[PDB]
């Protein structure tokens, strides 16, 4: 029954679903990631060894 409802209409309104993106392919990719660690760091990720 609960699988029939739509993430709303449900009395116990569970929190923060927001269904994020599924990414879905962009082939081989290069990721640029800058994060706070007081300090800031950047990590560059290569999907495969070819690139």
């Amino acid at each position: 029954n609960l699988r029939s409802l739509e993430t709303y209409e449900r009395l116990e309104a569970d929190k923060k679903k927001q269904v994020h993106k599924k990414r879905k392919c962009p082939g081989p990719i290069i990721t640029y990631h800058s994060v706070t660690v007081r300090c800031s760091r950047t990590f560059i990720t290569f999907s495969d060894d070819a690139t």
Binding site: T31, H33, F43, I44, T45, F46, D48
Partner: protein, 195 residues
């Protein structure tokens, strides 16, 4: 400054999760006549490393602040007498890897006025069309001169600039006409005027 001995990425199992090939540093070995230093750069410098045709044995300049790699050429040690390409083989940088010290240039306020009034503009339609037309002298507006005054004041406040006011020598001042003397009235009463 130096000759690129090595370009090696530092790999890590660092990321915020992820089954990829991650690097947290780019090791650049710069070799000058004085010695060799290994620099560890932001991984983002890998883009300009191959945007510039930077390989091992190339002479490069890495702005300490800008962080922009710049391939001057190739080291002249890798230069046979049977190689015809020129403006590619630059001598090995002398001295230390880490140095460009201070460049001091003296200008007049008119030089800044002229430079900012008509930009060089040698990159596009400005280039061909403006050069093709004759570069006449223009009547620079007080707006430009006020902006130049503001910029020079900010440069002096930052300590990058020093103001050395000079002296204007008008010989044969009797050759000026009444309009010129009337203007001199207002020009001599400005806080920015010379002697």
């Amino acid at each position: 400054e130096g000759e690129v001995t090595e370009l090696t990425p530092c790999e890590t199992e660092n990321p915020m999760g992820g089954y990829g090939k991650t690097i947290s540093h780019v090791i650049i070995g710069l070799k000058t006549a004085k010695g060799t230093k290994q620099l560890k750069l932001d991984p983002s410098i890998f883009e300009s490393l191959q945007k510039e045709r930077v390989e091992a044995g190339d002479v490069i300049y890495i702005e300490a602040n800008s962080g922009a790699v710049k391939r001057q050429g190739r080291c002249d040690t890798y230069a046979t007498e049977f190689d015809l390409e020129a403006e590619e083989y630059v001598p090995l940088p002398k001295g230390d890897v880490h140095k460009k010290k201070e460049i001091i240039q003296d200008v007049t306020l008119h030089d800044l006025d002229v430079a900012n009034a008509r930009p060089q503009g040698g990159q596009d339609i400005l280039s061909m069309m403006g050069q093709l037309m004759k570069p006449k002298k223009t009547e620079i507006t007080d707006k430009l001169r006020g902006e130049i005054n503001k910029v020079v004041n900010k440069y002096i406040d930052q300590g990058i600039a020093e103001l050395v006011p000079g002296v204007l020598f008008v010989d044969e001042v009797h050759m000026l006409d009444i309009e010129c003397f009337t203007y001199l009235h207002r020009a001599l009463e400005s806080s920015i005027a010379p002697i």
